[PDB]
């Protein structure tokens, strides 16, 4: 019942002595930028302390004044107020205690579940592991989508861009990629930049309804929050993701709008009066995203043994990134999209014309690419994805002949229906991630010709019923494929016998 008197006992054990501090005075306040006079020893990036527990960061160390940006609300600050050096750079809490929690860009809890118990803090701005400390990407990151996992595979330590116009499934694809990690071993981070607070709450409510929240850290910097917090949020989330990578483990990070981070950095720059370039962005907007995205990496066993000081051995850690960018009317030639397309390892392009034509996942497989490729796939998916590529390519070449299918040559007419049946197989539902064995049944059935007698309109109910059949009569075979995604003549014969038996009675 009584707690106030004991927490006060600790307060009587805190320093009451004088301390030498380096100070300054506020000269002007406008649009979130407070200009200060004094602070002769302040460092570029240091946090300034203002009256009222408000903090800022020094960004323009000019000869006669300091231009500082508020990491909170600046409408209470005024001319003549005192400003103090802290001697510290910006740091955020890190560790497993953040899993299943919603925090602001500074690591403060916003979910109302109580204080965080983090045992360590780390710097938001850090350099990425150098060239010689890395290891090639050769481990998979399954997203649960047949179109992405079969044709645009993502590996542990890769950076894959999700690019496309507004309202076409960009957020859905990244949230489902996080949901699929609840049993994988990969910890997940979702960073919300410039979103409305009710939208972030619908994603967290969907991470909880799907059992994925306990494996995810949610970092939020909503649309009403300071441009400095929106600019810093991706670096704070990256720092929380780097804990697991540097200690021998694997993590996944989603930056829901890098284009909104660029817009927030442009606001601060034009208000500090920095020289403008194309689309009014500052001269270092490429360096902004590049400094962030080069941290997503795979590090060697020698880096993990050096960092852990021997504690962790034989394990390679990684941080995989799924940055999201919005294009205006399909214009990929815009300044920010051009920069990020050149920084990333691959791109998943979503299209409005495909999305309106019922192709729900909307992945344009003709232009989407993964430079890591087959190295990021298990043996079974790598063997069944080769023909899927040929059939869709043939369908893109022969799509005008559908209105003249009668007049076509038989060989070409055979290819045309195969292309149309493989195209209908790629369609999937939201919040329905598929496992390696369940994806393998669908890809095997199409690639081995088991769909030639199924009307293009019944391909989906055939897939749904086939998976349900194998989940009842072949549970041991699905469990075997799900161990490592292995393939051999016994698994090939086993799947064939089950599909033949399925068609013969179901």
């Amino acid at each position: 019942s009584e707690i106030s008197e004991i927490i006060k006992g600790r307060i009587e054990k805190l320093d009451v002595a004088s301390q030498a501090r380096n100070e300054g005075t506020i000269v002007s306040v406008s649009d979130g930028i407070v200009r200060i006079y004094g602070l002769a020893d302040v460092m570029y990036g240091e946090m300034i302390e203002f009256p009222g527990g408000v903090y800022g960061m020094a960004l323009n160390l000019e000869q006669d004044s300091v231009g500082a940006v508020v990491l909170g609300e600046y409408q209470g600050l005024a001319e003549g107020m005192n400003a103090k050096c802290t001697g510290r750079i910006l740091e955020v809490p890190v560790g497993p205690e953040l899993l299943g929690r919603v925090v602001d860009a500074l690591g403060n809890p916003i979910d109302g579940k109580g204080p965080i118990d983090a045992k360590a803090t780390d710097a938001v701005e850090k350099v990425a592991p150098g060239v010689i400390w890395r290891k090639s990407v050769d481990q998979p990151v399954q997203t649960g989508y047949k179109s992405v996992d079969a044709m645009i595979p993502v590996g542990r330590g890769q950076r894959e861009l999700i690019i496309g116009d507004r309202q076409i499934g960009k957020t859905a694809l990244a949230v489902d990629a996080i949901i699929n990690q609840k049993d994988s071993g990969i910890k997940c981070v979702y960073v919300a930049i410039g979103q409305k607070q009710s939208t972030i709450a619908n994603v967290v409510r969907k991470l909880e309804e799907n059992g994925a929240l306990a494996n995810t850290i949610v970092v939020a910097a909503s649309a009403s929050e300071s441009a400095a917090l929106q600019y810093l949020a991706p670096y704070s989330g990256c720092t929380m993701g780097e804990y697991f990578r540097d200690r021998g483990e694997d993590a996944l990070i989603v930056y829901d709008d890098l284009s909104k981070q660029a817009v927030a950095y442009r606001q601060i720059s034009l208000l500090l009066r920095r020289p403008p370039g194309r689309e009014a962005y500052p001269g270092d907007v490429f360096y902004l995203h590049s400094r962030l995205l080069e941290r997503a990496s795979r590090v060697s066993e020698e880096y993990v043994e050096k960092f852990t000081n021997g504690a962790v051995t034989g394990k390679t850690g990684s941080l995989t990134a799924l940055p999201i960018i919005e294009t205006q009317a399909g214009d990929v030639s815009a300044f920010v999209p051009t920069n990020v397309i050149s920084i990333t390892d691959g791109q998943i392009f979503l299209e409005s014309a495909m999305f309106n034509s019922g192709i729900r996942p909307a992945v344009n497989a003709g232009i989407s690419v993964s430079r890591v490729g087959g190295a990021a796939q298990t043996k079974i998916i790598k063997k069944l994805s080769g023909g899927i590529r040929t059939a869709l390519a043939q369908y893109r070449e022969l799509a005008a002949f559908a209105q003249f299918a009668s007049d076509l040559d038989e060989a070409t007419r055979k290819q045309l229906e195969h292309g149309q049946r493989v195209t209908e197989l790629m369609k999937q539902k939201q919040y329905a991630p598929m496992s390696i064995a369940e994806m393998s049944l669908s890809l095997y059935a199409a690639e081995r010709g088991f769909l030639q007698d199924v009307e293009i309109a019944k391909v989906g109910s055939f897939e749904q019923a086939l998976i349900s059949y194998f989940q009842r009569e072949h549970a041991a075979l699905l469990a075997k494929i799900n161990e490592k995604g292995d393939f051999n003549d016994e698994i090939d014969a086993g799947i064939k016998a089950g599909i033949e038996k399925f068609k013969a009675t179901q």
């Binding site: 607070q197 409510r205 909503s222 300071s226 009317a329």
Partner: protein, 456 residues
């Protein structure tokens, strides 16, 4: 203490105060003699504040004494505001004398915290076929009417007000931001003659008013809606044009000493929009249901202002100039309009399949249009000829006569229920009306009236 005007340039005014008496950001100031209010926007330094006039400056001079009020603009709130017309400063702009206020709130406020947000999917029926089908609204949700000049934003909003506000049991706030003074007069006489003025608070800031007035009118109307939400009530908030708030910031931004960004916009476009939009929400105490009309400069949806607005709304209704140019109203684009409620778990599988079925036919017709123009219609397959006929029927069955548009058309208005809409579109997709001509579906209501129209 007291300040002196030192620099007047257009709508922006600089006032110099003692260096120990500098007024706060967003603080309201009053000019001596002249009846003018100035809001501090920036503290330049040396006791000087930069402010924007909430009136005209034709009578202002250098050296006029200015008084610090110690607070931001305080407007009247609560029951006393119902059935009254007011300006940005909260003064009554109707001849009914003073308002009996029992409290005044400051227009500037923090957005509700992350723990205060509330989630609800109660379906709200509008009575319009296109919206009830592809853009189902939700109680407590945010709706946006996107469109250029002359496509129906005001008309559609008036129809909704009529099909929702009139029946709504709770109160309502109507904010006319950068609106035509003629529309405000027609709406006031309409609410007064309909006996509904008793449950509607009216705040007006039209195009003839100074930039500062058009920049804060939205915060005044929202402050009145927030008082009612915080009392535990269910409220309706209608904003005539929220673009005028962004534009007033563009008109004044350069005089405030800010460098311009892309498409000549203020560098604070996304933050100024987020600070307003995050307050228009339904918390755990009460629910604000809001409809905003969003102007699209030169019909280009990629313009920074419209493009930054989509992320703040639950329901996005898009009006197309190409459909309006064919005499089809409501001019809603069924391929660009979207809602968070268009989900099988929320609306049901039958409605969802009918909406996706209509969108598939319209997207396929959009790509066959060029073929038909160059080669002709006989060079199409039998399946394509049938699909083109149904697409043209669906495109005309989305038109609807409205009660607020009878002066423009001469035809009586109609209200279609959601059951009737789904049935009419499911029938056209199925083929139950492949004999009736496409002209029978133009401006009718439910599918029975198309059957009657075809005979005549």
């Amino acid at each position: 203490s007291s300040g002196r005007i030192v620099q007047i340039i257009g709508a922006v005014i600089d006032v110099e105060f003692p260096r120990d008496a500098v007024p706060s950001i967003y603080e309201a100031l009053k000019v001596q003699g002249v009846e003018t209010t100035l809001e501090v926007q920036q503290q330049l330094g040396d006791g000087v504040v930069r402010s924007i006039a909430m009136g005209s400056t034709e009578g202002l001079k250098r050296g006029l004494n200015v008084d610090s009020t110690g607070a931001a603009i305080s407007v009247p709130v609560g029951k006393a505001t119902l059935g009254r017309i007011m300006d940005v400063l909260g003064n009554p702009i109707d001849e009914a004398g003073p308002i009996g206020e029992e409290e005044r709130w400051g227009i500037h406020r923090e957005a509700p915290s992350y723990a205060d947000q509330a989630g609800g999917n109660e379906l709200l029926e509008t009575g319009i076929k296109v919206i009830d089908l592809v853009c189902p609204f939700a109680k407590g949700g945010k709706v946006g009417l996107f469109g250029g000049a002359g496509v129906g934003k005001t008309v559609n909003m008036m129809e909704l007000i009529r099909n929702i506000a009139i029946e709504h049991s709770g109160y309502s706030v109507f904010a006319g931001v950068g609106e035509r003074t003629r529309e405000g007069n027609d709406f006031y006489h309409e609410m007064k003659d309909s006996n509904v003025l008793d449950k509607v608070a009216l705040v007006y800031g039209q195009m003839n008013e100074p930039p500062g007035n058009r920049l804060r009118v939205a915060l005044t109307g929202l402050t009145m809606a927030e008082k009612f939400r915080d009392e535990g009530r269910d409220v309706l908030l209608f904003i005539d044009n929220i673009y005028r708030y962004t534009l007033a910031g563009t008109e004044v931004s350069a005089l405030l000493g800010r460098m311009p960004s892309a498409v000549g916009y203020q560098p604070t476009l996304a933050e100024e929009m987020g600070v307003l939009q995050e307050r228009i929400t339904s918390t755990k105490k009460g629910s604000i249901t809001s409809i905003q009309a969003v102007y699209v400069p030169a019909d280009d949806l990629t313009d920074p202002s419209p493009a930054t607005t989509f992320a703040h709304l639950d329901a996005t209704v898009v009006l197309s100039r190409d459909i309006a140019s064919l005499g089809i109203y409501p001019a809603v684009d069924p391929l660009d309009s979207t809602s968070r409620q268009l989900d099988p778990l929320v609306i049901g599988q039958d409605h969802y399949d009918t909406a996706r079925g209509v969108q598939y036919v319209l997207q396929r017709y959009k790509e066959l249009k060029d073929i038909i123009a160059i080669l002709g219609m006989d060079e199409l397959s039998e399946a394509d000829k049938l699909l083109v006929a149904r697409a043209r029927k669906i495109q005309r069955f989305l038109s609807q006569p409205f009660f607020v548009a009878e002066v423009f058309t001469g035809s009586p208005g109609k209200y279609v229920s959601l059951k009737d809409t789904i049935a009419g579109f499911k029938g056209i997709l199925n083929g139950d009306y492949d004999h009736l001509p496409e002209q029978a579906f133009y401006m009718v209501g439910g599918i029975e009236e198309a059957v009657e129209k075809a005979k005549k």
